[PDB]
Design an enzyme around this catalytic site. Sequence first.
Site, PDB file in Angstrom:
ATOM      1  N   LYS A  23       1.108  -1.187  -0.150  1.00 47.46           N
ATOM      2  CA  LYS A  23      -0.213   0.345  -0.073  1.00 47.46           C
ATOM      3  C   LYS A  23       0.803   0.978  -0.027  1.00 47.46           C
ATOM      4  CE  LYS A  23      -1.984   2.123   3.482  1.00 47.46           C
ATOM      5  NZ  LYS A  23      -0.764   1.669   4.670  1.00 47.46           N
ATOM      6  N   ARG A  28       2.369   6.092  -2.989  1.00 48.23           N
ATOM      7  CA  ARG A  28       3.578   6.858  -3.159  1.00 48.23           C
ATOM      8  C   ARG A  28       4.292   6.656  -5.089  1.00 48.23           C
ATOM      9  NH1 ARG A  28       4.457   5.257   1.834  1.00 48.23           N
ATOM     10  NH2 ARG A  28       5.846   6.662   2.954  1.00 48.23           N
ATOM     11  N   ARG A 124      -7.935  11.852  13.377  1.00 47.08           N
ATOM     12  CA  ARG A 124      -6.533  11.286  12.734  1.00 47.08           C
ATOM     13  C   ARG A 124      -6.294  13.041  12.094  1.00 47.08           C
ATOM     14  NH1 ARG A 124      -4.485   7.072   9.248  1.00 47.08           N
ATOM     15  NH2 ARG A 124      -3.231   7.268  10.821  1.00 47.08           N
ATOM     16  N   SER A 167       3.097  11.552  13.369  1.00 41.36           N
ATOM     17  CA  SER A 167       3.009  10.876  12.056  1.00 41.36           C
ATOM     18  C   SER A 167       3.928  11.151  10.865  1.00 41.36           C
ATOM     19  CB  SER A 167       1.403  11.354  11.236  1.00 41.36           C
ATOM     20  OG  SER A 167       1.369  10.285  10.454  1.00 41.36           O
ATOM     21  N   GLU A 311       3.461  -0.917  12.355  1.00 44.09           N
ATOM     22  CA  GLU A 311       2.062  -1.127  12.070  1.00 44.09           C
ATOM     23  C   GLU A 311       2.436  -2.980  12.139  1.00 44.09           C
ATOM     24  OE1 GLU A 311       3.063  -0.892   7.040  1.00 44.09           O
ATOM     25  OE2 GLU A 311       4.469  -0.151   8.751  1.00 44.09           O
ATOM     26  N   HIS A 340      -3.800   6.219  15.510  1.00 45.34           N
ATOM     27  CA  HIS A 340      -3.782   5.767  13.940  1.00 45.34           C
ATOM     28  C   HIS A 340      -5.192   5.685  13.347  1.00 45.34           C
ATOM     29  CE1 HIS A 340       0.158   3.382  13.078  1.00 45.34           C
ATOM     30  NE2 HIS A 340       0.194   4.431  12.493  1.00 45.34           N
ATOM     31  N   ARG A 344      -5.322   1.904  18.548  1.00 41.64           N
ATOM     32  CA  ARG A 344      -4.512   0.624  17.999  1.00 41.64           C
ATOM     33  C   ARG A 344      -4.402   0.003  19.515  1.00 41.64           C
ATOM     34  NH1 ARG A 344      -1.691  -0.076  12.440  1.00 41.64           N
ATOM     35  NH2 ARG A 344      -4.157  -0.036  11.050  1.00 41.64           N
ATOM     36  N   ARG A 385      -6.126  -4.030  10.087  1.00 37.40           N
ATOM     37  CA  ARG A 385      -5.068  -4.938  10.882  1.00 37.40           C
ATOM     38  C   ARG A 385      -5.418  -5.490  11.905  1.00 37.40           C
ATOM     39  NH1 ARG A 385      -1.573  -4.754   7.733  1.00 37.40           N
ATOM     40  NH2 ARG A 385      -0.922  -2.782   6.585  1.00 37.40           N
ATOM     41  N   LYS A 410      -9.110  -2.107   3.673  1.00 37.79           N
ATOM     42  CA  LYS A 410      -8.609  -1.233   3.382  1.00 37.79           C
ATOM     43  C   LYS A 410      -6.973  -1.441   2.434  1.00 37.79           C
ATOM     44  CE  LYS A 410      -6.792   2.549   6.536  1.00 37.79           C
ATOM     45  NZ  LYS A 410      -5.207   2.896   6.416  1.00 37.79           N
TER      46      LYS A 410
HETATM   47  C1  LIG Z   1      -0.937   3.654   9.897  1.00 38.20           C
HETATM   48  C2  LIG Z   1      -0.919   2.525   9.031  1.00 38.20           C
HETATM   49  O1  LIG Z   1       0.773   2.583   8.171  1.00 38.20           O
HETATM   50  C3  LIG Z   1       1.607   3.260   7.909  1.00 38.20           C
HETATM   51  C4  LIG Z   1       2.054   3.788   5.900  1.00 38.20           C
HETATM   52  C5  LIG Z   1       3.143   4.773   5.956  1.00 38.20           C
HETATM   53  C6  LIG Z   1       3.073   5.236   5.264  1.00 38.20           C
HETATM   54  O2  LIG Z   1       4.141   6.661   5.084  1.00 38.20           O
HETATM   55  O3  LIG Z   1       3.023   4.635   3.705  1.00 38.20           O
HETATM   56  C7  LIG Z   1       3.211   5.095   7.238  1.00 38.20           C
HETATM   57  C8  LIG Z   1       3.194   4.655   8.439  1.00 38.20           C
HETATM   58  O4  LIG Z   1       2.624   6.168   9.233  1.00 38.20           O
HETATM   59  P1  LIG Z   1       2.553   6.328  11.063  1.00 38.20           P
HETATM   60  O5  LIG Z   1       4.560   7.211  11.229  1.00 38.20           O
HETATM   61  O6  LIG Z   1       1.700   8.034  10.084  1.00 38.20           O
HETATM   62  O7  LIG Z   1       2.738   5.529  11.935  1.00 38.20           O
HETATM   63  C9  LIG Z   1       2.446   3.787   8.903  1.00 38.20           C
HETATM   64  O8  LIG Z   1       2.773   3.449  10.307  1.00 38.20           O
HETATM   65  C10 LIG Z   1      -1.548   0.969   8.885  1.00 38.20           C
HETATM   66  O9  LIG Z   1      -1.088   0.745   7.304  1.00 38.20           O
HETATM   67  O10 LIG Z   1      -1.046   0.578   9.356  1.00 38.20           O
END
Ligand SMILES: C=C(O[C@@H]1CC(C(=O)O)=C[C@@H](OP(=O)(O)O)[C@H]1O)C(=O)O
Length: 424
Positions: A23, A28, A124, A167, A311, A340, A344, A385, A410
């Site tokens: 994903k 990207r 979020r 994040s 994750e 998240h 979670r 998840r 998802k």
């Molecule tokens: C939250 C999920 O995936 C995310 C995919 C993601 C990205 O940059 O692609 C970046 C990470 O983000 P953060 O820094 O907010 O944790 C992941 O954890 C998931 O799928 O469970």
Amino acid sequence: MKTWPAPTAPTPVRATVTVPGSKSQTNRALVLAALAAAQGRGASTISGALRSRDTELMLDALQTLGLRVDGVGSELTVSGRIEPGPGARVDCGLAGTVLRFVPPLAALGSVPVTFDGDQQARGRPIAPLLDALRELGVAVDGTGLPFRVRGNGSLAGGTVAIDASASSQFVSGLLLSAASFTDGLTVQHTGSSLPSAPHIAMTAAMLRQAGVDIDDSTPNRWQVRPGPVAARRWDIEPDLTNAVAFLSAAVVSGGTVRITGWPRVSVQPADHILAILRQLNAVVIHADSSLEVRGPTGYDGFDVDLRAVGELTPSVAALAALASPGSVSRLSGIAHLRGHETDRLAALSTEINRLGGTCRETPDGLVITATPLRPGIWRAYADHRMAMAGAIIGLRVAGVEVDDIAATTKTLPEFPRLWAEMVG
Ligand SMILES: C=C(O[C@@H]1CC(C(=O)O)=C[C@@H](OP(=O)(O)O)[C@H]1O)C(=O)O
């Protein structure tokens, strides 16, 4: 809605599983293909792309901005311009990557693009990134969803300081479009606690594959030079995070699962994943372009830092719950997970405790004591998840049902079929 009965594994699971595209990478590739097209460099193709609710939300976001995204299966072609129509409105759904990666892209347009989302999406974090965009010369109405980006066909660019503790996607979203800013961009993360380093590195790496000049030699600082984003073919890897739910099946059942086409060298945190599996004394081998894991006949409690791979927390919490009776496990580094899809840490705690487990939230994670579990209804909280974590638990606990297995769409719409075929 009917529940989904999680099939048990009274005997060692034995299977070869193909999981679809990543994903993170797919979304990207779509943003960078968009920038290239909007730069006038032509159409890009993404091969082996994930087709899922999160990537469908992404291209729809892109189509809302004016671009054209074709493809029926896993081959996606991106073309066109950033030229949003009147009242353009991006539906961010529950996809953080849309929420965080697309407002910078819309700033190159010349109309107000509204961003909206699920009521759950409205919880979020996004305010830091919006403030960043303001500092960088974009008019943005609102501090949360829904908000409006009022683009004047140009983002000045330059240098900005952001607290991205909440994040990593705030850094990734800035970095992905920065090549298109006049002055390019220098981003400084302030303070500490930067989660998910491998995903900012994934951004850096794919930028370099698109011929973008990015400097990340000093930690917490990134410099991107204004420049062309190349139109190219992107080759998508299997999603390694989703692979781990299937591999956990080998681990809790003492069986054997192979993931086809595992990449020897990859833009995903494969080393972190393999190392965590070996922590539980799983046997991990690379064979015939596929990854094979042999679970042990049993395992005790473990301490695991998940700061860089947050994750994985639901699947690993499931592994911790199924450890030898009395085993204590500590999952750490993951305070940021309260922010998240769903919080979670609360969710995992709630659901495991409902099955008669012992999971305690801590300021930065979970402490989990394996205790016998009972039948119950495992709630997904609309989180893919969480859904897969309940599947892992029901392999070893009869009578477990997930309320909403469809939450898996998802990132892995075919999970029920895939999982049924692996356990049968
Ligand atoms: C939250 C999920 O995936 C995310 C995919 C993601 C990205 O940059 O692609 C970046 C990470 O983000 P953060 O820094 O907010 O944790 C992941 O954890 C998931 O799928 O469970």
